[PDB]
Scaffold this motif. Structure first.
Motif, PDB file in Angstrom:
ATOM      1  N   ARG A  69      33.617  26.032  66.147  1.00 51.79           N
ATOM      2  CA  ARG A  69      34.386  25.502  67.704  1.00 51.79           C
ATOM      3  C   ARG A  69      34.820  24.059  67.498  1.00 51.79           C
ATOM      4  NH1 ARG A  69      33.636  22.916  72.061  1.00 51.79           N
ATOM      5  NH2 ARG A  69      31.645  23.104  72.240  1.00 51.79           N
ATOM      6  N   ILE A  70      33.565  22.863  67.100  1.00 47.19           N
ATOM      7  CA  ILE A  70      33.575  21.511  66.877  1.00 47.19           C
ATOM      8  C   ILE A  70      34.909  21.298  66.039  1.00 47.19           C
ATOM      9  CG2 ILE A  70      32.616  19.643  66.426  1.00 47.19           C
ATOM     10  CD1 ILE A  70      29.880  21.123  67.197  1.00 47.19           C
ATOM     11  N   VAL A  80      37.710   5.555  68.339  1.00 39.58           N
ATOM     12  CA  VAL A  80      36.528   6.156  68.257  1.00 39.58           C
ATOM     13  C   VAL A  80      35.935   7.840  69.371  1.00 39.58           C
ATOM     14  CG1 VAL A  80      34.852   5.056  70.552  1.00 39.58           C
ATOM     15  CG2 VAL A  80      35.996   3.549  69.111  1.00 39.58           C
ATOM     16  N   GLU A  81      36.959   7.550  69.679  1.00 39.99           N
ATOM     17  CA  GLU A  81      36.961   9.619  69.902  1.00 39.99           C
ATOM     18  C   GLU A  81      36.454  10.307  69.030  1.00 39.99           C
ATOM     19  OE1 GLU A  81      40.300   8.754  72.955  1.00 39.99           O
ATOM     20  OE2 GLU A  81      39.920  11.326  73.155  1.00 39.99           O
ATOM     21  N   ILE A 140      32.682  13.291  65.398  1.00 38.90           N
ATOM     22  CA  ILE A 140      32.177  13.694  63.899  1.00 38.90           C
ATOM     23  C   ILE A 140      30.204  13.978  64.079  1.00 38.90           C
ATOM     24  CG2 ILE A 140      31.765  12.381  62.061  1.00 38.90           C
ATOM     25  CD1 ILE A 140      34.783  11.366  61.944  1.00 38.90           C
ATOM     26  N   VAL A 141      30.290  12.781  65.547  1.00 45.33           N
ATOM     27  CA  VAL A 141      28.745  12.731  65.358  1.00 45.33           C
ATOM     28  C   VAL A 141      28.197  14.130  65.910  1.00 45.33           C
ATOM     29  CG1 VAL A 141      26.749  11.364  66.638  1.00 45.33           C
ATOM     30  CG2 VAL A 141      28.450  10.166  64.945  1.00 45.33           C
ATOM     31  N   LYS A 142      29.138  14.334  66.287  1.00 51.65           N
ATOM     32  CA  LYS A 142      28.818  15.834  67.324  1.00 51.65           C
ATOM     33  C   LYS A 142      28.740  17.047  66.842  1.00 51.65           C
ATOM     34  CE  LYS A 142      30.699  16.650  71.371  1.00 51.65           C
ATOM     35  NZ  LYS A 142      31.949  16.560  72.278  1.00 51.65           N
ATOM     36  N   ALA A 143      29.796  17.285  65.134  1.00 53.82           N
ATOM     37  CA  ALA A 143      29.848  17.440  64.607  1.00 53.82           C
ATOM     38  C   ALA A 143      28.746  17.890  63.455  1.00 53.82           C
ATOM     39  CB  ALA A 143      31.303  17.701  63.511  1.00 53.82           C
ATOM     40  N   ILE A 144      27.999  15.974  63.134  1.00 50.81           N
ATOM     41  CA  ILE A 144      26.731  16.596  62.227  1.00 50.81           C
ATOM     42  C   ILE A 144      26.081  16.797  63.293  1.00 50.81           C
ATOM     43  CG2 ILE A 144      25.456  14.357  61.091  1.00 50.81           C
ATOM     44  CD1 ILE A 144      28.688  13.772  60.634  1.00 50.81           C
ATOM     45  N   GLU A 145      25.605  16.211  64.449  1.00 48.24           N
ATOM     46  CA  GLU A 145      24.371  16.895  66.020  1.00 48.24           C
ATOM     47  C   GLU A 145      24.177  18.301  64.844  1.00 48.24           C
ATOM     48  OE1 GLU A 145      23.812  14.620  68.918  1.00 48.24           O
ATOM     49  OE2 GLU A 145      22.446  16.418  69.375  1.00 48.24           O
ATOM     50  N   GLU A 185      19.307   7.169  63.675  1.00 44.55           N
ATOM     51  CA  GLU A 185      19.879   6.277  63.577  1.00 44.55           C
ATOM     52  C   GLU A 185      21.664   5.575  64.002  1.00 44.55           C
ATOM     53  OE1 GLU A 185      19.638   5.009  59.552  1.00 44.55           O
ATOM     54  OE2 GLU A 185      20.972   2.834  60.306  1.00 44.55           O
ATOM     55  N   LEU A 186      22.381   7.151  63.153  1.00 47.47           N
ATOM     56  CA  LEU A 186      24.228   7.169  63.258  1.00 47.47           C
ATOM     57  C   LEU A 186      24.058   7.465  65.209  1.00 47.47           C
ATOM     58  CD1 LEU A 186      26.567   8.357  62.906  1.00 47.47           C
ATOM     59  CD2 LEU A 186      26.156  10.549  62.265  1.00 47.47           C
ATOM     60  N   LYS A 187      22.991   8.374  66.094  1.00 48.48           N
ATOM     61  CA  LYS A 187      22.852   9.004  67.496  1.00 48.48           C
ATOM     62  C   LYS A 187      22.873   7.118  68.513  1.00 48.48           C
ATOM     63  CE  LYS A 187      21.093  12.416  69.048  1.00 48.48           C
ATOM     64  NZ  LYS A 187      22.947  12.960  70.295  1.00 48.48           N
ATOM     65  N   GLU A 188      22.171   6.034  67.522  1.00 50.48           N
ATOM     66  CA  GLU A 188      22.270   5.029  67.928  1.00 50.48           C
ATOM     67  C   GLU A 188      23.818   3.785  68.214  1.00 50.48           C
ATOM     68  OE1 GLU A 188      19.157   1.523  68.559  1.00 50.48           O
ATOM     69  OE2 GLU A 188      17.617   3.057  68.150  1.00 50.48           O
ATOM     70  N   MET A 189      23.963   4.304  66.250  1.00 47.63           N
ATOM     71  CA  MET A 189      24.889   3.342  66.148  1.00 47.63           C
ATOM     72  C   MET A 189      25.970   3.748  66.962  1.00 47.63           C
ATOM     73  SD  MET A 189      24.448   1.068  63.855  1.00 47.63           S
ATOM     74  CE  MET A 189      23.641   1.006  62.902  1.00 47.63           C
ATOM     75  N   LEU A 190      26.253   5.284  67.965  1.00 48.58           N
ATOM     76  CA  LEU A 190      27.207   5.307  68.778  1.00 48.58           C
ATOM     77  C   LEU A 190      27.030   4.659  69.853  1.00 48.58           C
ATOM     78  CD1 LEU A 190      30.073   7.344  67.946  1.00 48.58           C
ATOM     79  CD2 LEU A 190      27.921   9.133  69.161  1.00 48.58           C
TER      80      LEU A 190
END
Lengths: 71, 70, 69
Positions: free
Chosen positions: B20-21, B42-43, B48-53, C23-28
């Protein structure tokens, strides 16, 4: 369940090879970003990151498959 | 073994969320190609970080389940 | 013993991955403050290390699955 496990492991292996290839490309393009962080290069890097994440999700799917068989 | 079945079900739900992500991520990817400018970038980074998380969480649940199979 | 040791490698690899994710979470969050140019590049670099860490964890996970089989 022998064919199932070993067949999935072979696909899991191929999936991993694909990940390493995309990661190699991701690191090649990362060096471009350093030499000159353009905005179109950033765009390209983002695209390959999504390809990597795609490949990663695909790998995790095959992994879950193999975990079903193992159970 | 109840936990194994339960974790697989959990592992299964985590996967669905990933796709879904991934679809969401794939959508926005052809929305910076139309507007190759800042903060749309940035959006995407946010997603991307959401997907990685979500990916790391999926791997956490996966390993947790492998500790059980052993 | 393969299983036991591979599982331990998986634990360490997963820890490595979760650390990079923090770290990635903070960078965001830093990016939600001031989108910049150097800032953006800094996030992409961390994202690549996370992916590298993730591929490594998935490789170790596969070996752990080999042993289980």
């Amino acid at each position: 369940t022998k064919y199932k496990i070993k067949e999935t492991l072979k696909r899991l292996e191929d999936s991993l090879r694909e990940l390493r290839r995309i990661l190699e490309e991701l690191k090649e393009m990362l060096e471009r970003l350093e030499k000159n962080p353009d905005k179109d290069v950033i765009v390209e890097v983002l695209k390959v990151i999504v390809k990597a994440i795609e490949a990663s999700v695909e790998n995790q799917r095959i992994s879950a498959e193999n975990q079903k068989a193992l159970a």
